[PDB]
Amino acid sequence: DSTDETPASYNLAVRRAAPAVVNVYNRGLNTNSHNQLEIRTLGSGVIMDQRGYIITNKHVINDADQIIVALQDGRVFEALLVGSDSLTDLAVLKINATGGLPTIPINARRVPHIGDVVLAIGNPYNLGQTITQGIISATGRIGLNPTGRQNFLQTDASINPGNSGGALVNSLGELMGINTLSFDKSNDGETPEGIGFAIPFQLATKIMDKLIRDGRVIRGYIGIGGREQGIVVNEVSPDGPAANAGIQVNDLIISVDNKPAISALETMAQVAEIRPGSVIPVVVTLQVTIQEYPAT
Amino acid sequence: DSTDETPASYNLAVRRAAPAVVNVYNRGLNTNSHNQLEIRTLGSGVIMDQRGYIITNKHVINDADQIIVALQDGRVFEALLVGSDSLTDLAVLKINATGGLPTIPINARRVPHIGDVVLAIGNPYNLGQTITQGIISATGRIGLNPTGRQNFLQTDASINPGNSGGALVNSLGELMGINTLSFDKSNDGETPEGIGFAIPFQLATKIMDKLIRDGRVIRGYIGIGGREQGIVVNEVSPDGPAANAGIQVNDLIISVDNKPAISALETMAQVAEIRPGSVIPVVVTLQVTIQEYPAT
Amino acid sequence: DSTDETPASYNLAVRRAAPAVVNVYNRGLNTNSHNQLEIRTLGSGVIMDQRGYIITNKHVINDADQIIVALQDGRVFEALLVGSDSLTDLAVLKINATGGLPTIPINARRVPHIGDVVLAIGNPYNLGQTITQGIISATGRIGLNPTGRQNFLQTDASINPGNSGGALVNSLGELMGINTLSFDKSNDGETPEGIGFAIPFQLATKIMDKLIRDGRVIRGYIGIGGREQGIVVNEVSPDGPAANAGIQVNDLIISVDNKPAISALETMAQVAEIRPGSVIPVVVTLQVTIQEYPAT
Amino acid sequence: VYYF
Amino acid sequence: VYYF
Amino acid sequence: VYYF
Numbered sequence A, B, C: 001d002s003t004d005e006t007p008a009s010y011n012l013a014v015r016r017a018a019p020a021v022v023n024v025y026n027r028g029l030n031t032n033s034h035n036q037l038e039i040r041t042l043g044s045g046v047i048m049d050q051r052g053y054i055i056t057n058k059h060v061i062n063d064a065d066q067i068i069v070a071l072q073d074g075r076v077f078e079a080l081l082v083g084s085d086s087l088t089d090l091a092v093l094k095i096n097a098t099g100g101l102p103t104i105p106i107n108a109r110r111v112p113h114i115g116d117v118v119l120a121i122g123n124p125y126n127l128g129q130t131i132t133q134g135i136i137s138a139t140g141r142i143g144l145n146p147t148g149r150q151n152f153l154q155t156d157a158s159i160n161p162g163n164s165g166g167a168l169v170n171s172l173g174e175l176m177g178i179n180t181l182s183f184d185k186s187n188d189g190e191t192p193e194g195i196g197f198a199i200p201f202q203l204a205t206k207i208m209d210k211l212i213r214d215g216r217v218i219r220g221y222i223g224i225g226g227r228e229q230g231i232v233v234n235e236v237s238p239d240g241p242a243a244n245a246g247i248q249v250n251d252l253i254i255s256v257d258n259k260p261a262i263s264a265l266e267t268m269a270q271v272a273e274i275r276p277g278s279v280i281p282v283v284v285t286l287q288v289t290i291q292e293y294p295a296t
Numbered sequence D, E, F: 001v002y003y004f
Helices: A011-020 A201-213 A241-245 A264-273 B011-020 B201-213 B241-245 B264-273 C011-020 C201-213 C241-245 C264-273
Strands: A021-029 A037-049 A053-057 A066-070 A076-078 A080-085 A090-094 A117-122 A130-141 A152-155 A167-170 A175-182 A196-200 A224-226 B021-029 B037-049 B053-057 B066-070 B076-078 B080-085 B090-094 B117-122 B130-141 B152-155 B167-170 B175-182 B196-200 B224-226 C021-029 C037-049 C053-057 C066-070 C076-078 C080-085 C090-094 C117-122 C130-141 C152-155 C167-170 C175-182 C196-200 C224-226
Touching: A011 A021, A011 A117, A011 A167, A021 A053, A037 A117, A037 A175, A053 A175, A053 A201, A080 A201, A090 A201, A117 A175, A130 B130, A130 C130, A152 A175, A175 A201, A196 A201, B011 B021, B011 B117, B011 B167, B021 B053, B037 B117, B037 B175, B053 B175, B053 B201, B080 B201, B090 B201, B117 B175, B130 C130, B152 B175, B175 B201, B196 B201, C011 C021, C011 C117, C011 C167, C021 C053, C037 C117, C037 C175, C053 C175, C053 C201, C080 C201, C090 C201, C117 C175, C152 C175, C175 C201, C196 C201
Parallel strands: none
Antiparallel strands: A021 A037, A021 A066, A037 A053, A053 A090, A066 A076, A080 A090, A117 A130, A117 A167, A130 A152, A152 A196, A167 A175, A175 A196, B021 B037, B021 B066, B037 B053, B053 B090, B066 B076, B080 B090, B117 B130, B117 B167, B130 B152, B152 B196, B167 B175, B175 B196, C021 C037, C021 C066, C037 C053, C053 C090, C066 C076, C080 C090, C117 C130, C117 C167, C130 C152, C152 C196, C167 C175, C175 C196
């Protein structure tokens, strides 16, 4: 056999997306360091737009004395922490570049489907930009933690330490999500294989926009945590807007703010959207003024 | 670059096959439970036909006080154990549904080839239906155990606990096999990667048909185990049809029932097919009456 | 849905390449053995050309009393060790076959690209020829070790013990490299997933040609190891051609043999190419006679 | 448990 | 060992 | 460290 044939390849996706994916270094001083910077943690980051805003995980840049960003083209920048959000484990970095910057392809009209071929781009173990290939295993995953939803994309594209904050793209090179977490829980002590999670791009975008506009993400906070037709109240926070509304533990809640309350997650999402300081109707009819979510 | 382009995806296979793949829960009472059902084990299952017959692994449903089946569409059924076979680690469940049931696409004329893209569908760690992508690494594999053949398909599609009893399909969505086993043996204590086994669909079908027709799988049993032209006898079972045929340990065996005996596996397969109670010629010429294989 | 459809498959690549990939057994006598051959190590090998020359890893055949080669067609040969090179971890075996031999497809004009679909062919855990599927994650990787370059291809095609010396091919079946190393370093004790390395085919070829022509690979050796415009000298070998050139530790080195010296790796590669015994100009101008690289 |  |  |  002779070959004028063309090898099956995802190089096109690689060429479109990889340049925008950067190596992120969290450097910190040590009592050991004696005035010398050392790497606390390392991960990846995605260049969202030509202004030089970069998405990455919050745990990658946490407690950093200095943040270094390295492009694949060789350029190195010191990075400015625009803001972070523990809840989505996201963070925005700013680098200033007079010269042109590569950006990650984004198609906001694109709908990620289960079975879509995807590439994970990142910096595993600081070996240099690695490309691994998998599919979208699932969508709307809550992750390993039972609480907090977060609509994770699940992928079997190989993910390792250093991949955090990196990009997940399809064969077209479009951004699917931000690689964040790898499943490690063991039943019988075995090691989970091909189970990793990414923040969906749509969510990543919204969070980035809010961090660029304000130093933090702002959510309306009732003050009360409860477990689920209706939703009962399991705990009212001490000295809470809650307590100030004088809410009573356990009163079932049928609906809120001109809307029904069957799913708690749907309800909390609604609560988050609402501006802090606003007062709304609740069905158990007691008035309460929301305060912005307590910082974490 | 602009994209009217179509992402490479196995969604079609996913949409055709996933609905038929179900979450299987083995629930048992505990001395601890005090009258409360708890999950002993969890795995997957495949809906074979609209009558509501489901294939799954035997080790998934073993010693179950109750078996719960959950479809992806939301429906939940209690399941009836039709039968099981330790030898192939298969088991058939029955659920009764007046409403329509999704079924796994089957193409009996389809020949699985090494290098065929395949998707593993199942419920890893009870996270919800997961889709992983690999290829058929090999066929006719005996598995980790040296004994018992069983013609396993080997795949590097990521397999984890909870995947057992789930489906392995190609890009067309056709059933390739039933995911059963993951290789875990370590040389130097390392963890094997991308090595999993599935019962070939053709075999799965035959076993299901026999379990639906009879409570168990019925095989003719000589009573004698030996290790390999010809095949010698290493042991004759005490009080065996064997012993009753008065067979003598070690007599080489050239042929049986009008046929040659070069491969032991070929010979045993022939023995299994034959009806219990039948008497056949053997070449060492001593007559023997087969009894059905002892239960395990 | 009905299917006259064709399943996505890499079988073509499998059919073109797999026959050339062989099972390699390193057999050694044991004090335990008492005159009986036992398997020390097992791996894979690639049939490069019809003369019966096979590439494999050096660590696979090291300290072998006997080397057995097994083809997928059933043939078994004893193998002759043509030569080995610790530096590239390569080794060439010779088997004599009057009958035709399968050879691995080679396209010297083919350029491996990041994102190219590749298949790993080998003998994991001696289960028999396994085929795993991944992409080319990276090129020009130095491997886990910081020293010695070696231009590794990085792939997330699943690699396990027994895969060493086996082939890495694209969808067309063309040889991409020789699977050699799997990343095992753990940060926090986790297990790296989908990170394996292969010797690029172009390099494999050159090394094979040199081993076939001469019992060993021959490189010019300065005698001095140093760490990096210019390159300083950190150590001069005792009684070295170096010491004999009377080189002085630490003298920066601007250029050598009518050429600049900015990159040490580029410089060492040049040194290796040069014939042993030759004397060349060096910029720090002191004359020195190279000797062939000391054996390891 | 859900907090909001 | 094979049993049958 | 590089040796050559």
